[PDB]
């Protein structure tokens, strides 16, 4: 059975939380403190094996690290989906208002 | 078969143009 | 393509020259009344 991989992904944690490995960058606007500065770093440094690895990005201020800690519960990671990360789509996925 | 039909009707119309111009009933005064 | 271009250039020049010289050939006189 042929499968739409984007629809299937909506049934995983990607459908529930910000997926550090896949979600387009505008999604980081949902929470205080994430955009654009941390959003850029997080997308630039993906993929991550677990949500906690996001704290291992080099060069972070201490305030930056605390903002991440406060927001880990809003994050998830799932396997990288080629259809979501090609075409520069994490930075601009063709959706505006 | 459809392409043939459409081009056939078109060709009949161009032929018709030819007869209607050059083999018209000639206008005669009075 | 070069030959085609040169051909078309020649063809167009030929016809434009007919139009211009044609209209230069006493056009106002070519009418049924005053010439």
């Amino acid at each position: 059975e042929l499968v739409n991989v984007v629809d299937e992904k909506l049934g995983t944690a990607y459908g529930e939380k910000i997926d550090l490995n896949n979600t387009n960058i505008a999604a980081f606007i949902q929470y205080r403190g994430l955009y654009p500065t941390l959003a850029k770093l997080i997308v630039k440094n993906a993929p991550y094996e677990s949500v906690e690895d996001v704290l291992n990005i080099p060069g972070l201020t201490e305030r930056q690290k605390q903002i991440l800690r406060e927001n880990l519960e809003h994050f998830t990671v799932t396997e990288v989906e080629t259809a979501l990360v090609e075409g520069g789509d994490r930075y601009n996925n063709g959706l505006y208002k | 078969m459809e392409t043939i039909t459409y081009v056939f009707i078109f060709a009949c119309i161009i032929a018709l143009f030819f007869f209607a111009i050059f083999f018209r009933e000639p206008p005669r005064i009075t | 393509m070069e030959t085609l271009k040169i051909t078309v250039y020649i063809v167009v020049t030929f016809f434009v020259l007919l139009f211009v010289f044609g209209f230069l050939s006493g056009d106002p006189a070519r009418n049924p009344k005053r010439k």
Partner: protein, 137 residues
Amino acid sequence: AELTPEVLTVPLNSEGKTITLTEKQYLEGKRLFQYACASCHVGGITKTNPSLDLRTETLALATPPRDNIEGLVDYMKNPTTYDGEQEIAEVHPSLRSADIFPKMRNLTEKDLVAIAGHILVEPKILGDKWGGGKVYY
């Protein structure tokens, strides 16, 4: 339905203090928002960056919070990115960049308050249409 003192009552500061704007101030806020801001923020969106809108809920989650007069007035003097991390006066109209954004040159403190009051009042009137974009036209 009417434009009542209640509709015109908005947050003055981060601490829960409110201010009731007058109708003259409401008129003035619309006029001045059209004058200085609407070329990019018509209807509460942002044409050159659609990810950021002027909805009150979006303003509340900005850093520093922009869902009150003080936060909006300060934004108009010294605008920042959404996380508070960079100062963007050089690419966003502000009092501090009135040299390069000449329409800011004659905006008074009073005018900034009026424009901030428009930003908070309009969604109380238009609801989701404010910051909604074409979907809600």
